[PDB]
Chains A and B, each alone.
With several copies, the nearest count.
Chain A
Amino acid sequence: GDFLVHHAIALGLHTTTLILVKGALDARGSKLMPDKKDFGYSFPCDGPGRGGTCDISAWDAFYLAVFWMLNTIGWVTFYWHWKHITLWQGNVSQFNESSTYLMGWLRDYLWLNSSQLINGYNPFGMNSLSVWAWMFLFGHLVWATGFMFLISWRGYWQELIETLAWAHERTPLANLIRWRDKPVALSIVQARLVGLAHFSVGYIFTYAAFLIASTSGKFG
């Protein structure tokens, strides 16, 4: 069971270094953008020409590699937590037999250890684990909110904000109030940063709540 998870960790490491090294070594330019150094470390793109230039800057390579870093660290932390929680319970054989296939990870680690956490508050009362139960769903919600910024892009939101500006300008008793900064949608690079921040915050909080609650419901 350890042999497979160690190679998963190695794959995660290699892929993350691949992304980061490719971003660093192509920062000054490439065949698609020979003059990349002339635009800086962080720029949105080079436009729809030459086939399309989405996420061509070096900052975008880091933005992509953060997801792989999070996935790799999640793998190593899952491994550590599952290997220790079974050792503290007196039955290592649960990990030895169930870690060789991924359904074992899904059922005997995630599903099995979330029984106490999700029962922090229920229609029959609450206990001291309710904070972690609330934070579990809080992290889920933030993680899902990040998908909005990571999937939907700017033009849809700008065209929608135009209609809201018209609606405010035509509403009685609200024309008396005027904005001082013109409302615009988030920038292309700004939205990537915001979505990545939401993704990372949800990723950290969900696992922190799950780990603390699962290790504190039974104390190993």
Chain B
Amino acid sequence: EVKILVDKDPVKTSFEEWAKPGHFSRTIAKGPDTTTWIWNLHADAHDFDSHTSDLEEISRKVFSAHFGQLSIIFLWLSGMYFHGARFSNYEAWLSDPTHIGPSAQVVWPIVGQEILNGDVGGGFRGIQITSGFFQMWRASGITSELQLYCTAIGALIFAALMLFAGWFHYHKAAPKLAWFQDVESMLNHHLAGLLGLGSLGWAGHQVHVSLPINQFLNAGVDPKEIPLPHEFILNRDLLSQLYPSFAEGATPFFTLNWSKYAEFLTFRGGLDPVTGGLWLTDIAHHHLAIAILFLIAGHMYRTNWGIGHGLKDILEAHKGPFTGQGHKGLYEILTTSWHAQLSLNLAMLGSLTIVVAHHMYSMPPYPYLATDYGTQLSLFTHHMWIGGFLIVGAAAHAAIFMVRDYDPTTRYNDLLDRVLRHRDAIISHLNWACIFLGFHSFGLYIHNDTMSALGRPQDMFSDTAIQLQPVFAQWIQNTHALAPGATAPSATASTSLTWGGGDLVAVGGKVALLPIPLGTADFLVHHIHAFTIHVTVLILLKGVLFARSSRLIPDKANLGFRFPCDGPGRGGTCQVSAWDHVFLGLFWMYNSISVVIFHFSWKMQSDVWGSISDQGVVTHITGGNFAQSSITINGWLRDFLWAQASQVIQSYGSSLSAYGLFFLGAHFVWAFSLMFLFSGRGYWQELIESIVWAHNKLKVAPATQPRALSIVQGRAVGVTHYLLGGIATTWAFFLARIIAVG
């Protein structure tokens, strides 16, 4: 039976364990003898399953940690709304969004730093923001600074609520293990309750507060004379003028005359020409349909009454001649291992973030977002990085599950067993695929570079030379462009302007979107992307599959998930643990995402973004140089890296001077990481031995004996600094370029 199960006062609230560092583990609680202890305290802080073997005790800890994270997120949102209300030019940007740059940060006049308050327009000095909050606030119907202050106060109250909830559910009412393992109820509530009701409420807000205020805004009326949102609920007459169908009330809904609501519930496609974003009437209908779909979906599983499905029943009925018993045993694995669930959820969330990034640029949902290039580039890059990091974490935690929670004697599964019985075939095939893709993707660039350097432009792989046309993607584009006429007759326009419908949307003399052409250069970059993705997959999958054992190390599981090596024997056994494989795969994820964002930036600046005059002529930022220059490595070096870095390197003495400083700092940190990556701790411990002598000579030697960083810790520091420096270099370069020229 599904019911609330709690335990009263399991852990006493006291400050006594705050004064004892390392209380959570047996080894660390004894106090430090060397400096390694100081690091070991921070590396094992959230490794709950290593603190205790009780599943219930671990689950309560993660449940409260989630509340803490939610409180932190609410504090962050409250700060964003408060800075929008108190230190921003939002109200001026509302009346002129095409000529005023959003800004919500103002610096103090100290040590000359007040130069960063640049001319963003609207009689305001500040730092231009690229988060896109202004367009979201305009879409939501927010018109005054007072409504942002109330949102900040509400977010503060909610953060306090989540913090209190975490304390209450760890110290007063701690749910039992059976409560957490009620997966059917959790799925039902998250599908129907959270998502369905949330989308239904947002749809209600859109049809009641967003649609009318945005209709007034798009009509060209002053924001300060638009009626307040509640005025559209009090006298329905105001709502019966923009849309006369509201005069009918809810009678059409209950009598199944839904076409009567076609005024504010539409299937249009394309973009709003005044706005440059998706029609709000389309978005409200989308959310209303998603609400019904999720509310019906959240009724699939059986909780307490007979109707519904059993997850174990579905899993045990899917087996075949090639897969033995099939999925039997997976319910036991996924209801007793936090790490497997974390791995699956991380992979799905990281994959979904990339889809969000891809969909937000091609279908701009927010008003005046498409013509704000700095916001678009920043959002795309940010979500790509988030997705890549989450995907890497998925592999890390799958390896952790394999090392710790895998047990064929009590939790056997045929599919996992059969995967482990032919891992050599999987890994060798992926190796061959990676080599083939690397050759037939990157060596074409080398061929083009050599042909260009040899004075033979006619022997290259180019649109004016040997062609490699992406015919399949071109066919998909043509099919999607013809959808409104044959395959989506009720739709008026295609789902995106990039499919090829031969139209361009211009807002404020700036190009929002237009059909994106695909040629040989795109054929090259797409296979480059596939190659890097395959190599990252190879590195991570090899670590997951070979974590327990290999022909080199028959007993790799006893060494743990995170160990440096197994000695210099067998020729050398460095970086054989599953942790190292994640450490190596982080670099390749970084490489892949960097290439993807470089591709996006160059393509958008060359073939989509630009300006349009009152003659009908389009002039792009880099003038369509992608097709003929992005086919050689020298082209990327010269026309992209050298040409577009001219902004960040001449930003000194302007409001963009903080990006050149961050450019240099990121370069410095990236170089700094190579000291940790290229060396080892045996040299550093010996070097420390001499400094300890100098300290002992002057009686200043500390009792906590200085130790060089551990073998694994040095790798972590090196990779963290490498990633930080690399990502910050592009952050500064992209922001400076797209703010100066965009």
Chain A in direct contact with chain B (Cβ < 8 angstroms): yes
- Contact at A164–B552, with CB atoms within 8 Å? no
- Contact at A163–B428, with CB atoms within 8 Å? yes
Q: Encode contact with A along B705-742: 1 for CB under 8 Å, 0 otherwise.
A: 00110110000000000000000000000000000000
| Complex: chain B residue closest to A57, CB-CB | B682
- Contact at B572–A158, with CB atoms within 8 Å? yes
Quote the shortest CB–CB distance from B685 to chain A (angstroms). Answer: 5
Please indicate the chain A residues that have their CB under 8 angstroms from the CB of B452 in the complex.
Answer: 121-123, 126
- Contact at A120–B453, with CB atoms within 8 Å? yes
- Contact at A158–B571, with CB atoms within 8 Å? yes
- Contact at A163–B689, with CB atoms within 8 Å? no
- Contact at B682–A188, with CB atoms within 8 Å? no
- B642 in contact (CB, < 8 A): yes
- B686 in contact (CB, < 8 A): yes
- Contact A160/B542 with A32-B685, A151-B587 known, Cβ cut-off 8 Å: yes
Quote the shortest CB–CB distance from A39 to chain B (angstroms). Answer: 11
Chain B residues 522-536 with CB under 8 Å of chain A are none
Q: A54-B682, A118-B638, A155-B573 are in contact. List 13 more A-B contacts (CB 8 A).
A: A47-B567, A48-B711, A53-B680, A111-B642, A114-B642, A118-B637, A121-B455, A123-B629, A126-B455, A155-B552, A156-B576, A166-B424, A167-B425
- A220 in contact (CB, < 8 A): no
- Contact at B634–A137, with CB atoms within 8 Å? yes
Please indicate the chain A residues that have their CB under 8 angstroms from the CB of B587 in the complex.
Answer: 151
- Contact at A162–B664, with CB atoms within 8 Å? no
- Contact at A134–B453, with CB atoms within 8 Å? yes
- Contact at A54–B642, with CB atoms within 8 Å? no
- B218 in contact (CB, < 8 A): no
Please indicate the chain B residues that have their CB under 8 angstroms from the CB of A137 in the complex.
Answer: 449, 633-634, 637
- Contact at B708–A51, with CB atoms within 8 Å? yes
Quote the shortest CB–CB distance from B404 to chain A (angstroms). Answer: 20
Quote the shortest CB–CB distance from B676 to chain A (angstroms). Answer: 10
Please indicate the chain A residues that have their CB under 8 angstroms from the CB of B678 in the complex.
Answer: 64, 67, 150-151
Chain B residues 406-445 with CB under 8 Å of chain A are 423-425, 427-429, 431-432
- Contact at A107–B649, with CB atoms within 8 Å? yes
Quote the shortest CB–CB distance from B732 to chain A (angstroms). Answer: 12
- A211 in contact (CB, < 8 A): no
Please indicate the chain B residues that have their CB under 8 angstroms from the CB of A170 in the complex.
Answer: 425
Chain B residues 556-582 with CB under 8 Å of chain A are 563-568, 570-576, 580-581
Please indicate the chain B residues that have their CB under 8 angstroms from the CB of A44 in the complex.
Answer: 568, 572
Quote the shortest CB–CB distance from B425 to chain A (angstroms). Answer: 7
A-B complex: 5 closest residue pairs judged by Cβ atoms: A54-B680, A56-B682, A153-B574, A55-B680, A167-B428
| Complex: chain B residue closest to A166, CB-CB | B424
- Contact at A22–B690, with CB atoms within 8 Å? yes
Q: Encode contact with B along A126-163: 1 for CB under 8 Å, 0 otherwise.
A: 10001101100100000000000011111110111011
Classify the interface of chain B: helix, strand, loop or mixed.
helix
A-B contact pairs, 8 of them (CB 8 A): A22-B690, A52-B680, A54-B679, A121-B634, A152-B575, A154-B572, A159-B551, A159-B552
- Contact at B424–A188, with CB atoms within 8 Å? no
- Contact at B581–A156, with CB atoms within 8 Å? yes
- B628 in contact (CB, < 8 A): yes
| Complex: chain B residue closest to A111, CB-CB | B649
Please indicate the chain A residues that have their CB under 8 angstroms from the CB of B649 in the complex.
Answer: 103, 106-107, 111
Quote the shortest CB–CB distance from B184 to chain A (angstroms). Answer: 40
Please indicate the chain B residues that have their CB under 8 angstroms from the CB of A130 in the complex.
Answer: 453-455
- A184 in contact (CB, < 8 A): yes
Q: Encode contact with B along A88-106: 1 for CB under 8 Å, 0 otherwise.
A: 0000000000000011001
Q: Encode contact with B along A197-218: 1 for CB under 8 Å, 0 otherwise.
A: 0000000000000000000000
- Contact at A188–B572, with CB atoms within 8 Å? yes
- Contact at A159–B453, with CB atoms within 8 Å? no
Please indicate the chain A residues that have their CB under 8 angstroms from the CB of B679 in the complex.
Answer: 54-55, 64
Contact of B427 among A114, A123, A160 (CB under 8 A): A160
Quote the shortest CB–CB distance from B169 to chain A (angstroms). Answer: 41
Please indicate the chain B residues that have their CB under 8 angstroms from the CB of A185 in the complex.
Answer: 571-572
Please indicate the chain A residues that have their CB under 8 angstroms from the CB of B542 in the complex.
Answer: 156, 159-160
Chain B residues 673-703 with CB under 8 Å of chain A are 677-683, 685-687, 689-690
| Complex: chain A residue closest to B546, CB-CB | A159
Count chain B residues whose beta carbon lies closer than 8 angstroms to a beta carbon of A.
Answer: 70
Please indicate the chain B residues that have their CB under 8 angstroms from the CB of A154 in the complex.
Answer: 571-575
Quote the shortest CB–CB distance from A130 to chain B (angstroms). Answer: 5
- B584 in contact (CB, < 8 A): yes
- A119 in contact (CB, < 8 A): yes
- Contact at A56–B428, with CB atoms within 8 Å? no
- Contact at B637–A32, with CB atoms within 8 Å? no
- Contact A155/B690 with A56-B682, A123-B628 known, Cβ cut-off 8 Å: no
- A180 in contact (CB, < 8 A): no
- Contact at A52–B711, with CB atoms within 8 Å? yes
| Complex: chain A residue closest to B464, CB-CB | A123
| Complex: chain A residue closest to B710, CB-CB | A52
- B650 in contact (CB, < 8 A): yes
Q: Encode contact with A along B450-477: 1 for CB under 8 Å, 0 otherwise.
A: 1011110100000000000000000000
- Contact A133/B568 with A64-B679, A151-B587, A164-B428 known, Cβ cut-off 8 Å: no
Please indicate the chain B residues that have their CB under 8 angstroms from the CB of A159 in the complex.
Answer: 542, 546, 550-552, 576
- Contact at B571–A107, with CB atoms within 8 Å? no
- Contact at B682–A32, with CB atoms within 8 Å? yes
- Contact at B572–A187, with CB atoms within 8 Å? yes
- Contact at B683–A46, with CB atoms within 8 Å? no
- Contact at A54–B664, with CB atoms within 8 Å? no
| Complex: chain B residue closest to A137, CB-CB | B633
- Contact A162/B680 with A154-B572, A187-B571 known, Cβ cut-off 8 Å: no
- Contact at B682–A45, with CB atoms within 8 Å? yes
- B635 in contact (CB, < 8 A): yes
- B610 in contact (CB, < 8 A): no
- A30 in contact (CB, < 8 A): yes
- B612 in contact (CB, < 8 A): no
Please indicate the chain A residues that have their CB under 8 angstroms from the CB of B685 in the complex.
Answer: 32, 51
Quote the shortest CB–CB distance from A196 to chain B (angstroms). Answer: 9
- Contact at B453–A103, with CB atoms within 8 Å? no
- A31 in contact (CB, < 8 A): yes
**B423, B424, B572, B677: which has the most chain A beta carbons within 10 Å?**
B572
Please indicate the chain B residues that have their CB under 8 angstroms from the CB of A26 in the complex.
Answer: 686
- Contact at A54–B681, with CB atoms within 8 Å? yes
- Contact at B664–A119, with CB atoms within 8 Å? no
- B660 in contact (CB, < 8 A): yes
- Contact at B683–A61, with CB atoms within 8 Å? yes
- B645 in contact (CB, < 8 A): yes
Please indicate the chain A residues that have their CB under 8 angstroms from the CB of B572 in the complex.
Answer: 44, 153-155, 158, 185, 187-188
- Contact at B686–A52, with CB atoms within 8 Å? no
Quote the shortest CB–CB distance from B450 to chain A (angstroms). Answer: 7
Quote the shortest CB–CB distance from B397 to chain A (angstroms). Answer: 20
- Contact at A55–B682, with CB atoms within 8 Å? yes
Please indicate the chain A residues that have their CB under 8 angstroms from the CB of B689 in the complex.
Answer: 30-32
Quote the shortest CB–CB distance from A131 to chain B (angstroms). Answer: 8
Quote the shortest CB–CB distance from B704 to chain A (angstroms). Answer: 15
| Complex: chain A residue closest to B539, CB-CB | A156
Quote the shortest CB–CB distance from B474 to chain A (angstroms). Answer: 23
Please indicate the chain A residues that have their CB under 8 angstroms from the CB of B632 in the complex.
Answer: 121
- Contact at B584–A152, with CB atoms within 8 Å? yes
- B600 in contact (CB, < 8 A): no
- Contact at B584–A155, with CB atoms within 8 Å? no
Quote the shortest CB–CB distance from A186 to chain B (angstroms). Answer: 9
Quote the shortest CB–CB distance from B669 to chain A (angstroms). Answer: 14
- Contact at A30–B431, with CB atoms within 8 Å? no
Q: Encode contact with B along A74-86: 1 for CB under 8 Å, 0 otherwise.
A: 0000000000000
Quote the shortest CB–CB distance from B572 to chain A (angstroms). Answer: 4
